[PDB]
Design a protein around this motif. Structure first.
Motif, PDB file in Angstrom:
ATOM      1  N   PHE A   1      13.998   5.103  26.238  1.00 25.01           N
ATOM      2  CA  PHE A   1      13.474   4.320  25.133  1.00 25.01           C
ATOM      3  C   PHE A   1      13.792   5.020  23.816  1.00 25.01           C
ATOM      4  O   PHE A   1      13.887   6.250  23.764  1.00 25.01           O
TER       5      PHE A   1
ATOM      6  N   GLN B   1      17.929  -3.444  31.394  1.00 27.31           N
ATOM      7  CA  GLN B   1      19.258  -3.058  30.934  1.00 27.31           C
ATOM      8  C   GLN B   1      20.289  -4.149  31.191  1.00 27.31           C
ATOM      9  O   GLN B   1      21.122  -4.434  30.323  1.00 27.31           O
TER      10      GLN B   1
ATOM     11  N   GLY C   1      17.463   1.041  23.398  1.00 26.34           N
ATOM     12  CA  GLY C   1      17.567   2.184  24.289  1.00 26.34           C
ATOM     13  C   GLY C   1      18.592   3.159  23.763  1.00 26.34           C
ATOM     14  O   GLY C   1      19.394   2.840  22.882  1.00 26.34           O
TER      15      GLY C   1
END
Ligand code: 4WI
Ligand code: 4WI
Lengths: 299, 299
Positions: free
Chosen positions: A6, A297, B122
């Motif tokens: 993160f 993702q 991310g």
């Protein structure tokens, strides 16, 4: 498909340096409280066998030096919650994010912001192992570094770093100061239980491989949940529950590969090996992506 | 040893979104300029065969929507530098870090902050391959995400994301808009060239193994740089440059193993294999840790 952490900015704004006597480590500054590992109070003699309540009652507020960047924060109170010290300061952190303290379960993942002298150094993704260690990267002075997840601007803190075991793995606490695993904050030889592999995560990662165009490991066989679990346990893998099968639902529906068909693929991988082939660049079966991690993702 | 990204906070504070028409990508807001991929000005028809000069001449400042979150930043000028658009805005970003724009070499690593609609998603580490692609993780809307390194609070920006090739690897520019490799920002058939293994990074990995006591592969031979380079190329390894030899300096000094002696050790592994032995618990030679990455993780 990369190991992805993160973004760390919301946590970087909370890191400070805590010094007591000879020891310097990191603290987490939220509102007007700084959380840090209580072993900061130990001398190099105390730390070999500390009686923490006896040691802490003998400390004064002025024994604690808290520095945010270059600015010293004045400590106006202090208490202990299990293995975590709570230093009340006279200044509120304006960078405090929306946050929660959570205790994670084995197999769940989180991001670590490794820090030294109150300054962030690096960020990486970890999983809580079934034996309650983490395979981190931590050096001297890293204690008080935290692990976290982020969900729509809310930071869920789940780990604070305390120690390195002789095998090179790491151990720490939740933000209530309770250790994950059978470890204690005392400098003495400590080993972990035998570790196992996080089966639901291996399966999620096999699905990530298929989403990214690799299918070499699939087969035409099927298995039952119970028969798969027998083989999994024989190979030191964790049991797969019906809840895990349900959690893998989105990945099965996206790829058209039934969960139990993917289990039959993994069974063949365990029984025959990878014969020198690689999946997503890895020569070993990767177990530090959860199903949610893959979905986040890949989509 | 694991892949460790830099803390992303200093970059997160510079991410914005840039919309032209219905196409939204990410931009980088430093001082009073926003940098982004020029293909933001293309429609889905333009991308197949764009004339960027003609497309830009039809645009005005009032056609560009720049937003920090949902807060619009007024555009007061626009220009194109190679493949990047530079939008001058009426507000200097108060979160601008000390920064440099740098162009990296193959083998150099960097952290990527993957972003969508200007919102960081991310962070992960990438290496520039010798074929000038990166093995990123990027979805629709990720263009304008940047890659960076941090050195003493100075952010060196080295990559801006533009495109995905059919093998799933990624291509982009430096922050002056010059592509890495022979790629162009047009939707037309393009392919990554044949790749090679990053020799300088494999050597850094071998030094890392030596530092940790894993040193069975150290032999009693040496080589010249030229002889090594000619052999390496026959194994699809990159030749070493004089700069590569020098960046291995600190690791060579720390271990007492001369660079050319380590080259002779690697040559033996290439010629005879590893014989079922592992290095750092791996049967494969890792080529995405630079000498700095190895030092960065033990310091
Ligand atoms: C490594 C070691 C021999 C030192 C020791 N371990 C054991 O005594 C064990 F055997 F129990 F594991 C150990 O970690 N500590 C001893 C002492 C604290 C902790 C400690 O120094 N923590 C560091 C925090 N800044 C982070 C460490 C440093 C190296 N890498 C890390 O992550 C406490 C357990 C109270
Ligand atoms: C992959 C696709 C077939 C769509 C195509 N690739 C090729 O044309 C190539 F093969 F030539 F490279 C690529 O067309 N794009 C078309 C158009 C830009 C780019 C593009 O969409 N960039 C995205 C930025 N938001 C990031 C992409 C989205 C998917 N994953 C990514 O990383 C430009 C070259 C001008």
């Amino acid at each position: 498909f990369r190991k992805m952490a993160f973004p760390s900015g919301k946590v970087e704004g909370c890191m400070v340096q805590v010094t007591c006597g000879t020891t310097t480590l990191n603290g987490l500054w939220l509102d007007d409280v700084v959380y840090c590992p209580r072993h900061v109070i130990c001398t190099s003699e105390d730390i070999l066998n500390p009686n923490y309540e006896d040691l802490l009652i003998r400390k004064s507020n002025h024994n604690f030096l808290v520095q945010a960047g270059n600015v010293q924060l004045r400590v106006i109170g202090h208490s202990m919650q299990n293995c975590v010290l709570k230093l009340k300061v006279d200044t509120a952190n304006p960078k405090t994010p929306k946050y929660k303290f959570v205790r994670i379960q084995p197999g769940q993942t989180f991001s670590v912001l490794a820090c030294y002298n109150g300054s962030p150094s690096g960020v990486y993704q970890c999983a809580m192992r079934p034996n309650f260690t983490i395979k981190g990267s931590f050096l001297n002075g890293s204690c008080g570094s935290v692990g976290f997840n982020i969900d729509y601007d809310c930071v869920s803190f789940c780990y604070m770093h305390h120690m390195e075991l002789p095998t090179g793995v790491h151990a720490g606490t939740d933000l209530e100061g309770n250790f994950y695993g059978p470890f204690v904050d005392r400098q003495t030889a400590q080993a972990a239980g035998t570790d196992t592999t996080i089966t639901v995560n291996v399966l999620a990662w096999l699905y990530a491989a298929v989403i990214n165009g690799d299918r070499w490991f699939l087969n035409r066989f099927t298995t039952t949940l119970n028969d798969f679990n027998l083989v999994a346990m024989k190979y030191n893998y964790e049991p797969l529950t019906q809840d895990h099968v349900d959690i893998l639902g989105p990945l099965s529906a996206q790829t058209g590969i039934a969960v139990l068909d993917m289990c039959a693929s993994l069974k063949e991988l365990l029984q025959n090996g990878m014969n020198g082939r690689t999946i997503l660049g890895s020569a070993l079966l990767e177990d530090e992506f959860t199903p949610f991690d893959v979905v986040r993702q890949c989509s």
